[PDB]
Design a protein around this ligand. Structure first.
Ligand code: HEM
Ligand code: HEM
Ligand SMILES: Cc1cc(N)nc(C[C@@H]2CNC[C@@H]2OCCNCC(F)(F)c2cccc(F)c2F)c1
Ligand SMILES: Cc1cc(N)nc(C[C@@H]2CNC[C@@H]2OCCNCC(F)(F)c2cccc(F)c2F)c1
Ligand SMILES: C[C@H](O)[C@H](O)[C@H]1CNc2nc(N)[nH]c(=O)c2N1
Ligand SMILES: C[C@H](O)[C@H](O)[C@H]1CNc2nc(N)[nH]c(=O)c2N1
Ligand SMILES: [Zn+2]
Lengths: 407, 411
């Protein structure tokens, strides 16, 4: 009820009080830790509304003030009449930023308060969605000088009038299963790439084909759109010493923009809410490039470094993993597209933890996700105990719409 | 009630029913996960349930459940408890107990080996000198001139908690660390306090970077006594690199025998406070943590200096690059000298098949992800992509506080 977290490298010890304001459930019990699992009416809404608005009015130095009470009453009357309510702009901006402040899996939260919010709640069709999305992508990209942004489409209603971006990110490469047996392009999107073509996408069948957005408006059938190619900034990957690296023909996109999540604010569900920041290098170099289920390039790379692939113990995978990540970071820097390395980003996160501890009483953080997928223990987050708990407003994972949409 | 873990790399799904035989608290709640926190006299009343649970288990495993042998041993243990307040394990129960503590060790990546453990029964030991001798024999048997073999030595159990056997060392073989007046350390920063207790206790310190601490040994609640392990018993490996000839001029070496001696073995409710055990190193324990943690030997800067890396910007990944070379060097060195060692690719792959096998044969495998995933190259080892349930089975190994914090000094 006054839990402590120790850093084992610096002996700094922090006291967490924020967790007793925790609301949702984690997956763990005192009998079983599920720390490493990827996925663990009118009456319901008003308390959720009340909970959120109380924190909002607290944060603006106006807890228990006339303006505060007036809003609680106004919101109560709207729920009782309509079955829901609408957020004020300012509430909506606060909510969005706080959902980012609460994502216990994001290492990047030092930035949480710098988030440009684009209120797309007046949108009604998928063409409108496309327009809004294009504008997001162009604003956030900013010719390589990336800026965090989120775009918020209309909240859930009866629940068969949902807005969704069917893509899991705004910008992703296609995947096709070949007669050969191997996979061409990105194997993570095969399923979605099929559903695209089935809806009429004229696939070029390449290894790096920017997918078309599939947008669903007001619970209607999903429609296809190509993002203006001049909007999708991409980066050709070269190595600062390995001249031959460019011949693997690798590129990656500059803008990471998660588009399949659900934002919950004060009991309201915003099911379409793509948001974007900028990459930490290991996300592309370690995961996208090297995972077995992804582009899986280690073998090809090791082979050109003429490493001894004869036995695991030469650590050829490890050697090649590093140079790949050096190449990712080098290319982005040379092309002036914002990117942060895992050292700098984890170091930023420790400052941000310490700031949230002294300024908020804590910081929910999921160690399994915060510690980079390479070089863990030489980055300072490895030595840092973290408590993970679920606060609201938050981003939540949601089922792929195709598993749930009625056609 | 069943639970499922997915492998996100292979889509294999496993079902855990083993967690239903689970006892101790995790530290987690439905509200908070403490999955990354390092640290999450027993009366007569509480002992026979624990004895019975253990002995039902043992007898199950030897295919004798409900036998006469089983019922008599239950009765016999009951009697011992009500007559003496404690009880004594048979040899075969001890062995089985200690194999299972290892099998249940959720933070141990080496568990495929659990059924091959050499148990040394040291329950007749009465004095520190006695402990020394037992320990020397352990070291020598386990080392086996570099062909390492897993072993554990088990000293008498806790009684009233006033007569505890303890090995004050955290590992039987570990180097000293000496804080200097300038603020810097010579040797292993992690052993400064304990090294200080050793000097306090009469040890004459060489004051070098790789000085093997003396054993500090407590028997029957008495004050502990010093003993130098015989240096001919201390296998060491000097660290060189297969391509970099300057690496040996860093002056590094490490001991071959990893032997944790600070944990408490719990079997059937009995508490063995001195049960030092040992196996063989995974390369990354030395090469990443021992050598490259900032609060340890901290050699990353010196190594990257020699490699002429660009050290002016973290994004050159000079730290990451020097780290791998070092790890290549540790493994090269152990292999050339014929000392058993396993790399992390090999260790995790072995672990994944053990875990799978355990699920089929036993209905689960408690695994702590935070500890199982190696501290470099995380996602190119198959453990990274593997969901894991963490839960506490007995018999088990527990952390216990350091003795100097608890010991009542006799004089
Ligand atoms: C500004 C630079 C940012 C950086 C460097 C960053 C970093 C990261 C990283 C490395 C992860 C783990 C992702 C993975 O391995 O798949 C992550 C997860 C996440 N971040 Fe960020 N982030 C940034 C911006 C944002 C923004 C603007 C938001 C919200 C508006 C956000 C919210 C999230 C959420 C909700 C997750 C977890 C997603 C999941 O469960 O898959 N991040 N972040
Ligand atoms: C085959 C040789 C072995 C290898 C390579 C191995 C591997 C490992 C590694 C890498 C760790 C974590 C290291 C750390 O961060 O300190 C560990 C932890 C552990 N292992 Fe093993 N293991 C081996 C044998 C054994 C044996 C023989 C036992 C006892 C019978 C054992 C019980 C444990 C326990 C209790 C822990 C957690 C210790 C703690 O909480 O500090 N292991 N194992
Ligand atoms: C089944 C499933 C569940 C879940 N909660 N998340 C995933 C996402 C899976 C989990 N690792 C790979 C994939 O993430 C891709 C998104 N990456 C971009 C980023 F989120 F990491 C990111 C990075 C930098 C800035 C950002 F704004 C940003 F959003 C999958
Ligand atoms: C506060 C604290 C709690 C806890 N449960 N363990 C520790 C021990 C901490 C945990 N990582 C650093 C320090 O261990 C040093 C020795 N480890 C050796 C080994 F266990 F990893 C090992 C490796 C290989 C074979 C073995 F038999 C073996 F026992 C510290
Ligand atoms: C804070 C965190 O739990 C701590 O640094 C852990 C992380 N994972 C680890 N994993 C192993 N094998 N050994 C360790 O000492 C640690 N340290
Ligand atoms: C099973 C395990 O939870 C899974 O591999 C997780 C581990 N940590 C992760 N960490 C990050 N940042 N991103 C991921 O996709 C994952 N995957
Ligand atoms: Zn947990």
């Amino acid at each position: 009820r006054f839990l402590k977290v120790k850093n084992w490298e610096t002996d700094v010890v922090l006291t967490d009080t924020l967790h007793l304001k925790s609301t949702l459930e984690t997956g763990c019990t005192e009998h079983i830790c599920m720390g490493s699992i990827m996925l663990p009416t009118k009456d319901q809404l008003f308390p959720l509304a009340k909970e959120f608005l109380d924190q909002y009015y607290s944060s603006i130095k106006r807890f228990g003030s006339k303006a505060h009470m007036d809003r609680l009453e106004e919101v109560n009357k709207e729920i009782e009449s309509t079955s829901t309510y609408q957020l004020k702009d300012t509430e909506l901006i606060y909510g969005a930023k706080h959902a980012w402040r609460n994502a216990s899996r994001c290492v990047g939260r030092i930035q949480w308060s710098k988030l440009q919010v684009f209120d797309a709640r007046d949108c009604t069709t998928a063409h409108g969605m496309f327009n809004y999305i294009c504008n997001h992508v162009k604003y956030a990209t900013n010719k390589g000088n990336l800026r965090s942004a989120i775009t918020i489409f209309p909240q859930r209603t009866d629940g068969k009038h949902d807005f969704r971006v069917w893509n899991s990110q705004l910008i992703r490469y296609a995947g096709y299963k070949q007669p050969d047996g191997s996979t061409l392009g990105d194997p993570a999107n095969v399923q979605f790439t099929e559903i695209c073509i089935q809806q009429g996408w004229k696939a070029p069948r390449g290894r790096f084909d920017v997918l078309p957005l599939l947008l669903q408006a007001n619970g209607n059938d999903p429609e296809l759109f190509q993002i203006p190619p001049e909007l999708v900034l991409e980066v050709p990957i070269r190595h600062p010493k390995f001249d031959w690296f460019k011949d693997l023909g690798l590129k990656w996109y500059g803008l990471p923009a998660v588009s399949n999540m659900l934002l919950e604010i004060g009991g309201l569900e915003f099911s379409a809410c793509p948001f974007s920041g900028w990459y930490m290098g290991t996300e592309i170099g370690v995961r996208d490039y090297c995972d077995n289920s992804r582009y899986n390039i280690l073998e090809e790379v090791a082979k050109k470094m003429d490493l001894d692939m004869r036995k695991t113990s030469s650590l050829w995978k490890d050697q090649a993993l590093v140079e790949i990540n050096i190449a990712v970071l080098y290319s982005f820097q040379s092309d002036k597209v914002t990117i942060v390395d895992h050292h700098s980003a984890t170091e930023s996160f420790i400052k941000h933890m310490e700031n949230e501890y002294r300024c908020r009483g804590g910081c929910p953080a999921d160690w399994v996700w915060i510690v980079p997928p390479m070089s863990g223990s030489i980055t300072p987050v490895f030595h840092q105990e973290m408590l993970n708990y679920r606060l609201t407003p938050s981003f939540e994972y949601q089922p792929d719409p195709w598993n749930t949409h009625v056609w």
